[PDB]
């Protein structure tokens, strides 16, 4: 929300380079050119391949690093105000439906050899994987809100993983996957039907929270996990800590800015540096769950 934070689309080139300084060491060689071209948060959110190449980024590993950061930037600018449990459930049911219609589709085509081949096409893996992603996202949202049914999805996602690893004909692999698909959805519907109708549509918000240290460079007293997806997530605080007493930092919160600097795609290293910079306190912009 524009009261707590200024849109990424409003960032100046300086603001762009600033956030770029906390990304991977191997990408700094480029910020010189981003500078010179006056690349703004505007253009950044939609940077294209050809643009990355003109900025000097040939090694598409380096490209992918940048775009994975900018993808996170997009989740923040468009998604935070938007993503709710309904959204997430729709995305899960959708990727399962599409998988199903994929399977039954393949099977009526003239070129089908699924009853003979055990060679599983790459479509299948990307689909299965993507669906498992949808289910993990649903569950990461469920944990920060109001156990049996949590194991369900986990098992179901696992049944998927073992299905595509079985030295199996593809018709049988397809029957097995088709089954997981139908039930995974049903579980998803059930999770929804069991959900309070005020929370189920609410999305997350931002908050500013100011800490005050009481000794030079003291522990603020929070524990922070940095997910592979890039997230910096507070997992808990410690008693009699600034963080604990402020009553405003909670497990599940995600560090969005540190001292008014967006640290979203950052390497733990540089986030750590950010948090430590001022021994006297820290301003945290936290992504807060609707609960």
């Amino acid at each position: 929300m524009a009261l707590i934070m200024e849109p990424v689309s409003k960032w100046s080139p300086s603001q762009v380079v600033d956030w770029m300084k906390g990304l991977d060491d191997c990408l700094q060689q480029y910020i010189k050119n981003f500078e010179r071209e006056k690349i703004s948060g505007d253009q950044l959110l939609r940077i294209t391949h050809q643009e990355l190449e003109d900025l000097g980024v040939s090694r598409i590993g380096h490209q992918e690093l940048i775009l994975e950061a900018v993808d996170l930037l997009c989740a923040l600018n468009y998604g935070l105000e938007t993503e709710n449990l309904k959204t997430l459930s729709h995305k899960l049911n959708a990727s399962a439906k599409n998988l199903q219609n994929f399977i039954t589709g393949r099977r009526r085509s003239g070129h089908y050899d699924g009853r003979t081949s055990r060679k599983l096409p790459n479509d299948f893996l990307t689909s299965v994987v993507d669906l498992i992603g949808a289910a993990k996202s649903l569950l990461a949202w469920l944990d920060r809100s109001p156990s049996v049914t949590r194991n369900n999805v986990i098992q179901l996602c696992l049944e998927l993983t073992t299905i595509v690893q079985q030295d199996c004909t593809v018709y049988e692999t397809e029957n097995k996957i088709l089954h997981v698909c139908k039930t995974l959805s049903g579980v998803c519907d059930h999770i929804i039907s069991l959900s309070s109708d005020p929370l189920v549509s609410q999305s997350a918000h931002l908050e500013v929270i100011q800490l005050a240290n009481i000794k030079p460079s003291e522990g603020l007293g929070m524990y922070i996990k940095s997910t592979y997806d890039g997230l910096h997530v507070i997992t808990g605080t410690t008693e009699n800590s600034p963080a604990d007493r402020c009553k405003k930092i909670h497990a599940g919160d995600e560090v969005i800015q540190v001292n008014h600097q967006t640290v979203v795609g950052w390497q733990l290293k540089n986030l750590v540096n950010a948090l430590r910079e001022d021994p006297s306190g820290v301003i945290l912009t936290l992504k807060k769950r609707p609960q």
Binding site: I60, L125, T126, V129, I132, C157, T161, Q165, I224
Partner: protein
């Protein structure tokens, strides 16, 4: 999060045919662990694997690896850090 040299050895292990032909494209483009997992047919063509035939086999391993990561990720969901 595995190293660039790590990837190269993973390719020699799982994509032997492709390594003789296309070892260098992974070196030239600095395909780290995080980068390998984001890889797609269209991207692979951009690093210079011109033949769709070979591109398939590389993703067949990339995706089979992506799958194995999800077994470990999903197991974890049933069982690093930093502190300030």
């Amino acid at each position: 999060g595995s190293t660039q040299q790590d990837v190269c050895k993973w390719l020699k292990k799982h994509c032997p045919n492709q390594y003789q032909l296309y070892s260098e494209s992974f070196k030239q483009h600095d395909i780290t662990g995080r980068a390998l997992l984001r890889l797609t047919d269209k991207k692979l063509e951009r690093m210079g694997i011109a033949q769709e035939n070979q591109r398939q086999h590389i993703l067949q391993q990339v995706l089979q690896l992506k799958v194995r990561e999800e077994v470990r990720n999903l197991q974890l969901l049933t069982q690093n850090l930093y502190f300030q």
